[PDB]
Amino acid sequence: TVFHKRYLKKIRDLGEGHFGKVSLYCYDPTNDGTGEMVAVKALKADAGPQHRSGWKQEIDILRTLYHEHIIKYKGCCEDAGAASLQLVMEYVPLGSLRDYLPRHSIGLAQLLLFAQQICEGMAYLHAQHYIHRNLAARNVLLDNDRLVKIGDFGLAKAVPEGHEYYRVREDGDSPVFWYAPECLKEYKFYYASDVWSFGVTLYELLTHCDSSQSPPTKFLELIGIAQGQMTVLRLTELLERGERLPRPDKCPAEVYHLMKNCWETEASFRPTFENLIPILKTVHEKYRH
Ligand SMILES: N#Cc1cc(Cl)c(C(=O)Nc2ccnc(NC(=O)C3CC3)c2)c(Cl)c1
Numbered sequence: 001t002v003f004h005k006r007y008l009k010k011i012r013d014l015g016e017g018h019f020g021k022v023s024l025y026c027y028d029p030t031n032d033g034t035g036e037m038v039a040v041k042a043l044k045a046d047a048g049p050q051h052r053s054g055w056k057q058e059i060d061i062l063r064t065l066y067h068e069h070i071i072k073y074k075g076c077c078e079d080a081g082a083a084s085l086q087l088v089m090e091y092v093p094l095g096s097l098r099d100y101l102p103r104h105s106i107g108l109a110q111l112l113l114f115a116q117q118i119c120e121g122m123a124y125l126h127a128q129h130y131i132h133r134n135l136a137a138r139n140v141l142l143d144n145d146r147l148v149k150i151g152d153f154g155l156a157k158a159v160p161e162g163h164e165y166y167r168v169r170e171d172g173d174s175p176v177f178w179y180a181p182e183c184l185k186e187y188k189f190y191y192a193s194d195v196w197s198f199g200v201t202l203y204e205l206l207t208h209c210d211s212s213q214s215p216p217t218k219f220l221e222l223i224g225i226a227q228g229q230m231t232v233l234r235l236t237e238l239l240e241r242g243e244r245l246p247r248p249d250k251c252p253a254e255v256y257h258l259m260k261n262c263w264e265t266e267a268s269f270r271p272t273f274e275n276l277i278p279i280l281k282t283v284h285e286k287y288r289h
Contacts, residue, residue, distance in 0.1 A: 001076065002076060003027060008025045010025055017041055019054055020044050021042055022040070023040050038088050038090070040089075042084075042087070045083075045084075058087070067121050068121075069118065069121030073089060074090055075088045092151075094142035097148075098136075108250070109287040110146070114205060116280035122150070122198065122273040125156075126194070131189055131194055134154065135150075136201055166188075166189045177200070177216045178201070179197065180196035195270045198262055199263045219245075222243065242265070
């Protein structure tokens with residue numbers, strides 16, 4: 001699929017991803033205004049070869065993924081000004097849950113349905129031999145009150161069939177407050193590491209993405225702000241001591257125990273995304289009416 005820059009009409013900026021900005025565009029070749037709304041993710045024109053290779057990877061991965069709980073790849077547009085490809089994705093009407101939840105009081109059963117859907121999209125992603133490496137409520141988009149879609153794949157990587165992990169490197173933009181201890185210490189990302197991040201994402205939905213209850217806030221309240229280059233080391237240590245994010249207000253005790261099970265120090269003790277699907281289907285059924 002191909003898109004033409006001449007027919008793209010900018011509405012407003014949607015935000016910042018891993019490898020650039022996301023903008024709301026009205027693709028209208030008829031010139032009336034009835035054209036379909038598209039989310040266009042662009043690579044910054046000033047980025048070096050280290051990001052240009054990572055951006056091409058993001059497009060390639062999203063183009064090969066097809067699932068109801070994963071943002072749809074619409075096509076590619078030739079960016080004449082940046083000499084790269086502009087990622088054309090579907091416009092998810094309600095946006096990210098990080099922006100949606102603090103302003104819209106969403107029921108317990110409804111949030112449980114979202115987590116179930118995240119697990120469904122994540123199980124497919126793992127079946128296609130890919131790790132997300134950036135699972136957070138910030139990267140979970142809402143299409144309607146009963147439908148959720150996984151957003152950005154800037155940090156997503158292909159796990160080669162022979163191995164169960166992918167070796168990561170030192171980076172300042174790493175979502176460390178959503179990362180398992182094995183990613184922070186041994187620099188290894190397993191399929192179980194995405195399950196740890198889901199547990200954190202589930203914690204966010206249950207707090208209604210309240211920034212004062214957010215993972216960086218709660219962990220920095222424990223670590224402190226005057227720890228030099230040892231913020232991640234102090235994070236690794238508290239996670240080893242068995243310290244975890246607190247139970248959100250009105251969150252059921254059994255749901256918090258599922259969270260803690262996604263937060264097992266040992267990667268092998270953590271449930272897979274396939275194990276979580278029938279479990280969340282039942283928990284959602286219990287809390288619905
Ligand atoms: N960090 C980060 C981060 C993560 C993601 Cl996944 C996005 C993103 O792609 N958001 C999208 C995509 C498509 N439609 C909408 N929809 C809306 O924004 C509607 C409210 C208007 C939002 C952004 Cl911008 C920043």
